[PDB]
Amino acid sequence: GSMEGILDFSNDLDIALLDQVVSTFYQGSGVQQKQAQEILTKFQDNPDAWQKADQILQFSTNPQSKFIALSILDKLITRKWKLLPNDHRIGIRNFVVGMIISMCQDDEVFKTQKNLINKSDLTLVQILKQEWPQNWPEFIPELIGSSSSSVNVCENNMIVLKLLSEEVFDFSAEQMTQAKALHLKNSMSKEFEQIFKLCFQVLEQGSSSSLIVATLESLLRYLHWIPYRYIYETNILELLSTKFMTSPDTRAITLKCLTEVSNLKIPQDNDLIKRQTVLFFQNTLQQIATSVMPVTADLKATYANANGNDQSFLQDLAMFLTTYLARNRALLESDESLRELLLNAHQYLIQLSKIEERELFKTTLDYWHNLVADLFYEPLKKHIYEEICSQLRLVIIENMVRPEEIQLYKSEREVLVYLTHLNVIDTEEIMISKLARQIDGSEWSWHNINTLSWAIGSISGTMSEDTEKRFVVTVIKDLLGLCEQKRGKDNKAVVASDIMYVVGQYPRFLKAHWNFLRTVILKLFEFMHETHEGVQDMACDTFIKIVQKCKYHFVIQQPRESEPFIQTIIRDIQKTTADLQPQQVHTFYKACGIIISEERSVAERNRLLSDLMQLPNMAWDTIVEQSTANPTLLLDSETVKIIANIIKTNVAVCTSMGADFYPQLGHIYYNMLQLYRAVSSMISAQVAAEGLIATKTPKVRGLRTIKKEILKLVETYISKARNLDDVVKVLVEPLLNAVLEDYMNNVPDARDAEVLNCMTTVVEKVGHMIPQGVILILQSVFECTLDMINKDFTEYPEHRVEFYKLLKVINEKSFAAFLELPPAAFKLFVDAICWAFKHNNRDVEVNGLQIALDLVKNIERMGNVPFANEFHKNYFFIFVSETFFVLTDSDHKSGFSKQALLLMKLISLVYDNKISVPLYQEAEVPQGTSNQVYLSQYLANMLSNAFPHLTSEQIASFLSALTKQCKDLVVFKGTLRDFLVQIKEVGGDPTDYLFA
């Protein structure tokens, strides 16, 4: 009601009404708050609102209103500043400087209004970016002058100089032109002598901790860019490493400053700098030991208790020690007197590494990796760290992670493998004695036995074979004893899994010892009958895991065995898998497939293959005989389950056998494609009988699974197929007749996106051999799929994704299929590519731009012929402007690189005279006119209309530069990014595009 008064700009703004609306937002709730939010937003986005800012900043008492006043000003300064008259520019500068000084004088406001003060400074820093130093040359001297008088002003000036350093050096790349970044960087660099003078004085004369923290906070930012000489050739390292490590308010920021010092660019051959780099580290550790905690402090307990800012401090300490030691530990390894310092710093890292905090642990593990790698390769280092490394072994083992947490596991294993090589005797000891403390029950728990098992398995293949043998036997003996000891089948199952986990990780041992391998596999088969949760999965996982590693020992005949063991597995395959779930059986069959692929006798592999596929081929044949003679039996959902499992079983075997699967595929191929058609009819019939809801029913989803697993089997085979003559001659023509018409003639909801996926793999592997088949694929799926996906960007996500993969691979492999498209259909091809540009979905966006780029390469490759000439006259300026549209709309930033590359390619064609026809039509430009001139003219006009706030000079400059730079890619990208900054503001400098 009354709150929408402030939107009426025809009157004076009621400041009390603003504060109502502002209070209602920040302190109210529900409907009240939400109505206030929309009015603040409409107020703030009102282009005239900045005029009523100095009004708010002097009259309003509410800091939140004042903050929003600065937010409106901040918007004007970064975007419409050069459009203002020059008296406004000075006027605004004056009351931003005047307000800041005004608030610092008042100690009440200085203390209680930190948020409003810091926003004022950031708003001041935006003015400097526009005006400094060309129109404010005396800013830095007048800043330093005010800093002697008032301590509050001095502290605030450090905040300003911090924010200034950030916006110039840390956050300029995206937000400024290259030329303006360089200007502000050189301008800060030129006056830093005077700024450092002030900081160093304030740090020595040190009266006030808030001032000293603010100065140290600014210093941290300077260290990203300043030359080393300011740190080393002054006294400032002594102050940081001693004075500011004692007091706790300064300690935190000082440690972050020294962390960045350790990364400074330093001459690597100067013995005073080397002593100075040792010195500050020595001091820093000395202050930690006497002022914070000694080397023996239990940092796990401290961190866990979470008092004050202890957790942040311990994090910063880790960062400091790792950063320095990674760069500089070499400086401490040769001197006898620095040995204690070296080992004390590493002991702190050992204690830090015991902290229960994943992300911190990761940080210290990167360092441990760095070190132990170096101790494994570098001469004479390892003996120094024997005691550190021995503790690390325990730390890594006690914190081992399951293999499924992929990355943390990899880093741990790597470190533990290096520490095992460095001293095998110690590693084995630590692992065995931990096992004895699982047997005695002192450290017994499900989690603890699991971590030890993951640890023991991580160091596989690092010991000598003869030592490994003794180690594994000991470990396995003890774990067997532990299982027999324990009671209740929860406990027994945990240990059985760990026993079987560890043997799975030692394939070399399993390879050397056949008797034992055989026992382990037969034991897994007994475990495939256990109903207890997790056991059957663990049995199947371990089986295929052992099978992947030891393939040869199943496929050949061992000593004192009547046959290769693969034959023994196949004979009881019914009995072995009888209690497993269907997906678990498929893993079993997949495993059996891996083994069979090792047999290189064709007669034998094919024989083993048909033996393996016996149950599913006998189930299959009886279903084919049933459901062909009477399609009534295919409506039963139980028959649909059985058929899907047969196909899934085939996919599983085909996955592991690839090209070797052909004789099995041949057995079922034609009946399978007939089943595909029969299933298709039922889906289309059910859709007409029940409606679109039919596609959701279990009945139809069952049938669609059959189709999808059939499509998946064929895709899987063709992806890995070695004999491509037989793929073309036998498989393809039947497949296309089965799948393409069905796809085309179903309503969109009944179309399987997997049809597209399947076709992509066909075009990939054999598209070059089937030009007529590829035309058939386009006719059947192109237009009808494009209509499903060209209304919005969300609907049919899988179809949308697989659609552009198919066009990509067709455009690569059988481009001639696009030539045979009618002109109207080829126009939809161009429409579809540009449609892919506009997707946020990266999968579609990347292929959209890729297709576009390859299409241009394909047209270029045709040379001076009428199709390529007609393509440029029709579609060149479509691609140029459609590319520009996505580059400059701020909603396709992820695609910048490939957009830039596509744009450059389009421009380079005209620059190299590769288009052999006038792009301009009859009478539109003079007769003797190059494409280069018309290209500049088209773009000058295009951009002028798309961005009417740019001057003609800005545009003409940009284009002159952009076309010159169309051979150098990264420079071209630079010019594009400059243009992206300049379109966000008014009055950008056109000379910025000469930055070279």
Binding site: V473, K477, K489, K492, N515, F516, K523
Partner: peptide
């Protein structure tokens, strides 16, 4: 023999008491 005695212990591994 140490590997064989271990293999025999492995044979009797069970989940039940």
């Amino acid at each position: 023999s140490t590997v064989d005695e271990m293999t025999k212990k492995f044979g009797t591994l069970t989940i039940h008491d």
